[PDB]
A paper describes a structure:
Here, we present high-resolution cryo-electron microscopy (cryo-EM) structures of the human A3AR in three distinct functional states: bound to the endogenous agonist adenosine, the clinically relevant agonist Piclidenoson, and the covalent antagonist LUF7602. These structures, complemented by mutagenesis and pharmacological studies, reveal an A3AR activation mechanism that involves an extensive hydrogen bond network from the extracellular surface down to the orthosteric binding site.
Despite moderate overall sequence similarity, the pose and position of adenosine in the orthosteric site were highly similar across all adenosine receptor structures. The conserved interaction network between adenosine and ARs includes a π-stacking interaction with F45.52, a bidentate hydrogen bond with N6.55, hydrogen bonds between the 3’, and 5’ hydroxyl groups with S/T7.42 and H7.43, and numerous hydrophobic interactions. Residue Y151.35 forms a hydrogen bond with E191.39, which forms a hydrogen bond with H2727.43 that positions H2727.43 for interaction with the 2’ and 3’ OH groups of adenosine and Piclidenoson. On the other hand, the conformation of the αN-helix in the adenosine-A3AR-[name] appears to be an outlier compared to the other adenosine receptor structures, suggesting this could be specific to adenosine-A3AR-[name]. Notably, the adenosine-bound structure shows fewer receptor-G protein contacts compared to the Piclidenoson-bound structure, potentially revealing ligand-dependent A3AR-G protein conformations. The binding mode of adenosine is highly conserved across AR subtypes, consistent with its role as the endogenous ligand.
Author numbering:
A (entry chain R): 9 to 206, 226 to 293
B (entry chain B): 7 to 340
C (entry chain A): 4 to 41, 46 to 54, 182 to 233, 240 to 354
D (entry chain E): 2 to 118, 135 to 247
E (entry chain G): 9 to 61
């Protein structure tokens, strides 16, 4: 296991880069009551989703890498938490992008139509949806539907490809919650670019979209190769998982730090 | 006419020249320094949302009142970081605040030219306005309670006035300044007071008969703050020329000049300690220097504020000092 | 821990904090416009000490602080208005022949406002008042009595456009603020329409700078 | 400032009755409210309490579960809902307002009062009845089990005066403090365990029953009663 | 002409007041701080038992 060893260690350092920044953000909001407004609410929801990656996802992402012999329903529930809070980070990125889209489409009415009550309802809605997308295989979409042999096997080894269905990853993980948000986020940022003109501001929108694409698209096409009967090496399969968690460590860098109000406090 | 007043200006000058035989530095060069004063923030009051412009302590050295530009007067329990009262204001433009010696009243004022007195101990339990004073034509700068019945106010129409809370009309008017009067300070015996103005001159007034006794000059810029010594025989002024100066009511001249070469910005608030050994001045470089008033040495820096320091005040027992600033934060230092 | 009365004192302090943030978003929702310039004509048709006028238009609440009654020094209270959206500045056009020159006193006031530390980020709306009386005055007297370097025709369109270009020439840090220039009409109500259109562009930039885009 | 309690009267033990009071003359939403029960020819008993904004609600252990207390701030009406009544609950019910901040005087006003027909600090009065001639200074002793001195430095004991035929009146709200509207002849001193109230002059208005109350920890317990006679 | 009535006799009433020497006048400022140096908590840091902050 000359490759698995370097994977596990790098998951912690990226892992602990993530958890320091997001905890910092939550305090900064609570220390400054001028920052307790509409704008910073969405940044709190992105920060809390990335804290849950640091304390839940990061221990559980190592467990499935060692293949420890555990119960089938225990290994599926451990991988169920790998999808609740990573998809919660993606849905929080869409909530910020629609929040910036209301700023250029509503104008004057933005501070009147959007109410503090409505922000919790919509943030909570996104969080709720994310919880259910991570809890789909346990209610009848488990791997046992593919073969009758897997129903008799109990106390197997915990491998992500052995418990999680290749089907769910390509059509419900990728096409509904990775592909549809990406095409929307491209359409929002393009529409902001046309209304700000009627190179310094063009790179601000392009960088935000570039890091989202770099973190989730190399892993998404690995699931397409395995489903199309291909074979992938594990040198790049481990690097895809790393990049899939690197989105949490760059969220306070690209969203909180660019805010000039935060830029003074920190 | 003017030639008779000009020759007696030299009559003030040569008597003052013969009065100064030595300096304060030549007396205090043979004493020990107080040392590098390092003091930290013990409490931070985070309730406000706009710039803090005025802050006054209480007589029991626990309750303080802070005035800000969002239209809120908040009474703070500085021991437990609590909000005893929150008083909404009729005009959001507030530049001064005051606390009664009995603790039953507070005052506020600003660009509305109106000094409002709020009652704190009423039967109904909510803070309500007790007396509305409106006789000035210039913006209110500083107000200080004498007791529950009379208050002295500073205004921007080059006048100071003495009021009466019960009648609601001023009894004495203090005239003679040419610049905008920016500050007040009440003496420990509450018989006489000073006022710093924008004519680079501060004048000492009598409360009883209402006449200016002495006139002090020396600054090359407008004065923003004033405070008596705890002895009551001296006071200090803070101006916009990055220079603090100390006066004596008996010597009637300059004694010490608190300035540094690297300080350029002006001074907003100046207060003394309990013993008068430490002078605390709030500058506009986002920090607050502590000046040893007998040695003209910066013995400590208070650099915990994001924006400029606008108001500061020391407790009656000398236990703590609170600093207000434009970043909506009150910080109690000890 | 705490006693039975200290727990209720902290609970009282928490109930105040939910009323401070309730009033904080109420005040930040409304828009503040400082009204400078020597003024009284624009406020009577849209509707001692500082006089503030509260009015609403198209579901937006405006407030205009008229500080024309302040006869004191402007330096001691101009930093109290740094958290505003736009300074409404009024220039009369019929005082160029009247006299110190009354027209040149407006440019001295305009130079001090734009070069302030506290008004660098804040936009400035410029109103050129009494445009009807300037048309009769420019026919009887030339504009060259004020400016010896005056060039071009003496017609009303060229003279009014000539005054405007020096007013924007006094602006420094042109990337930060934008000066909106309007000619006042006494009969029509288009003056308050220009204020709403100008303040919409500022708060869009204010909303975009909160998130970090623009 | 007045409190008029509505409701009350005859009721079966199987019945349930609702008690409410009318608050006027003060900012009702900023004041916490209490219900205090006075049994016939017995001491005062605390029932329930609501904080400001209905944040924290406490109950007495004997009436917990059976009793419900609620308030309506726009209505300025405080409600008590009683669902199960025994033969012990037949008593006079008073409503008390109280506000809590630094230097505050809680329990400062008492209602008129309507009639209805384990680890607690026990307050005991050493004397049942002391007949006092006017002009002679006396001390009324209140004895506690647990020490009322707290870490922040103020002892939480409250002195009340029951004039015959009227509502209770607060005289002294904490030790070395005096309430408003009370003359300067009332003076109190305290210790770790034993507390006393030292009056100097006596008049016709000073006769009655004196109750000491504690506010250190819920539930609040009153004194037995020190009657004075003429 | 208004300064002839007010400003003329105002400054001469400020002229004929007694002044002590500044060596003696600043000695009272020096001696006041030495007399109260033990009672100023901002100069000498008090222990945290009696300190409320
Ligand atoms: N093909 C895969 N093999 C192993 N783990 C995967 C795969 N696809 C997704 N995951 C896991 O799911 C998480 C996000 O769904 C990833 O960070 C990773 O832990």
């Amino acid at each position: 296991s000359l490759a698995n060893v370097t994977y596990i260690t790098m998951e912690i350092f990226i892992g602990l880069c993530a958890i320091v920044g997001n905890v910092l953000v939550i305090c900064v909001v609570k220390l400054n009551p001028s920052l307790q407004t509409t704008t910073f609410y969405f940044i709190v929801s992105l920060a809390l989703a990335d804290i849950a990656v640091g304390v839940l996802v990061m221990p559980l992402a190592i467990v499935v890498s060692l293949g420890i012999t555990i119960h089938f329903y225990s290994c599926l529930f451990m991988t169920c938490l790998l999808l609740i809070f990573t998809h919660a980070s993606i849905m929080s990125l869409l909530a910020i992008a629609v929040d910036r889209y209301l700023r250029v489409k509503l104008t004057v009415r933005y501070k009147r139509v959007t109410t503090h009550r409505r922000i919790w309802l919509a943030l909570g809605l996104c969080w709720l949806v994310s919880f259910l997308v991570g809890l789909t295989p346990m209610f009848g979409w488990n791997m046992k539907l593919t073969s009758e042999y897997h129903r008799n096997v109990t106390f197997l080894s915990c491998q992500f490809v052995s418990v999680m269905r290749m089907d769910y990853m390509v059509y419900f993980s990728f096409l509904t919650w990775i592909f549809i948000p990406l095409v929307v986020m491209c359409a929002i940022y393009l529409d902001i670019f046309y209304i700000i003109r009627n190179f310094k501001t063009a790179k601000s929108l392009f960088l935000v979209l570039f890091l989202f694409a770099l973190s989730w698209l190399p892993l998404s096409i690995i699931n397409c190769i395995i489903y199309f009967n291909g074979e992938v090496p594990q040198l790049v399969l481990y690097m895809g998982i790393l990049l899939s968690h690197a989105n949490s460590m760059m969220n306070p860098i690209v969203y909180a730090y660019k805010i000039k109000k935060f830029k003074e406090t920190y | 006419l003017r030639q008779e007043a000009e020759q007696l200006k030299n009559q003030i000058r040569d008597a003052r020249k013969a009065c100064a035989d030595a300096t304060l530095s030549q007396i205090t060069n043979n004493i020990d320094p107080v040392g590098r004063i390092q003091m930290r923030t013990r409490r931070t009051l985070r309730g406000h949302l706009a710039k803090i412009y005025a802050m006054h302590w209480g007589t029991d050295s626990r309750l303080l009142v802070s005035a800000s530009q969002d239209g809120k007067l908040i009474i703070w329990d500085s021991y437990t970081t609590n909000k005893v009262h929150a008083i909404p204001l009729r005009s959001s433009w507030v530049m001064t605040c005051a606390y009664a010696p009995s603790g039953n009243y507070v005052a506020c004022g600003g660009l509305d030219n109106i000094c409002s007195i709020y009652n704190l101990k009423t039967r109904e339990g909510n803070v309500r306005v007790s007396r509305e004073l409106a006789g000035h034509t210039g913006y209110l700068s500083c107000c200080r309670f004498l007791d529950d019945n009379q208050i002295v106010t500073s205004s921007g129409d080059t006048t100071c006035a003495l009021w009466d809370i019960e009648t609601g009309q001023q009894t004495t008017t203090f005239t003679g300044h040419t610049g905008d009067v920016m500050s007040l300070s009440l003496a420990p015996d509450t018989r006489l007071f000073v006022s710093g103005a924008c004519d680079a001159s501060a004048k000492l007034w009598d409360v009883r008969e209402g006449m200016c006794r002495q006139t002090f000059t020396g600054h090359e810029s407008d004065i923003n703050a004033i405070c008596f010594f705890p002895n009551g025989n001296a006071f200090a002024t803070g101006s916009d020329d990055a220079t603090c100066r100390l006066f004596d009511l008996r010597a009637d001249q300059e004694l010490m000049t608190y300035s540094h070469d690297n300080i350029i910005c002006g001074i907003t608030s100046v207060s003394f300690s309990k013993s008068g050994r430490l002078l605390l001045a709030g500058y506009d470089d986002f920090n607050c220097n502590v000046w040893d008033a007998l040695k003209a040495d910066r013995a400590g820096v208070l650099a915990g504020h994001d924006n400029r320091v606008s108001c500061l005040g020391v407790t009656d027992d000398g236990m703590a000092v609170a600093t207000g600033s434009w970043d909506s934060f009150l910080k109690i230092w000890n | 821990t705490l006693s039975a009365e200290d727990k209720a004192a902290v609970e009282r302090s928490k109930m105040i904090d939910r009323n401070l943030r309730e009033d904080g978003e109420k005040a930040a929702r409304e828009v503040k416009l400082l009204l400078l310039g020597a003024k009284n004509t624009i406020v009577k048709q849209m509707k001692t000490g500082i006089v503030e006028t509260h009015f609403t238009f198209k579901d937006l609440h405006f407030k205009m602080f008229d500080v024309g009654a302040q006869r004191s020094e402007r330096k001691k209270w101009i930093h109290c208005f740094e958290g505003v959206t736009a300074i409404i500045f009024c220039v009369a056009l019929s005082d160029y022949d009247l006299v110190m020159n009354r027209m040149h006193a407006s440019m001295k006031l305009f130079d001090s406002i734009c070069n302030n530390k506290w008004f660098t980020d804040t936009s400035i709306i410029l109103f050129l008042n009494k445009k009807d009386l300037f048309e009769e005055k420019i026919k009887k007297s030339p504009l060259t009595i004020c400016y010896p370097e005056y060039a071009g025709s003496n017609t009303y369109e060229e003279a009014a456009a000539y005054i405007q270009c020096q007013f924007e020439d006094l602006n420094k840090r042109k990337d930060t603020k934008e000066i909106y220039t309007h000619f006042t009409c006494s009969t029509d109500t288009k003056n308050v329409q220009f204020v709403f259109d100008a303040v919409t562009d500022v708060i869009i930039k204010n909303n975009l700078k909160d998130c970090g885009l623009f | 400032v007045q409190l008029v309690e509505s409701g009350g009267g005859l009721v079966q033990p199987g019945g349930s009755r609702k008690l409410s009071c009318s608050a006027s003359g003060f900012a009702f939403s900023s004041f916490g409210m209490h219900w205090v029960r006075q049994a016939p020819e017995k001491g005062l008993e605390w029932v329930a309490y609501i904080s400001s904004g209905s944040g924290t609600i406490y109950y007495a252990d004997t009436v917990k579960g059976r009793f419900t207390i609620s308030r309506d701030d726009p209505k300025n009406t405080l409600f008590l809902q009683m669902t199960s009544l025994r033969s012990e609950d037949t008593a006079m019910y008073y409503c008390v307002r109280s506000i809590y901040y630094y230097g505050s005087s809680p329990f400062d006003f008492w209602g008129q009062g309507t009639t209805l027909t384990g680890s607690d600090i026990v307050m005991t009065q050493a004397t049942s009845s002391v007949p006092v001639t006017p002009g002679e200074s006396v001390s009324i002793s209140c004895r506690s089990s647990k020490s009322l001195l707290h870490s922040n430095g103020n002892t939480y004991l409250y002195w009340f005066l029951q004039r015959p035929g009227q509502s209770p009146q607060l005289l002294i709200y904490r030790m070395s403090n005096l309430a408003s509207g009370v003359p300067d002849r009332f003076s109190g001193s305290g210790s770790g365990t034993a507390f006393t109230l030292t009056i100097s002059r006596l008049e016709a208005e000073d006769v009655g029953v004196y109750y000491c109350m504690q506010h250190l920890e819920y539930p609040l317990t009153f004194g037995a009663g020190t009657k004075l006679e003429l | 002409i208004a300064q002839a009535r007010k400003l003329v006799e105002q400054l001469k009433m400020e002229a004929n007041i007694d002044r002590i020497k500044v060596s003696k006048a600043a000695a009272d400022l020096m001696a006041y701080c030495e007399a109260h140096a033990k009672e100023d908590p901002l100069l000498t840091p008090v222990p945290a038992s009696e300190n409320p902050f």
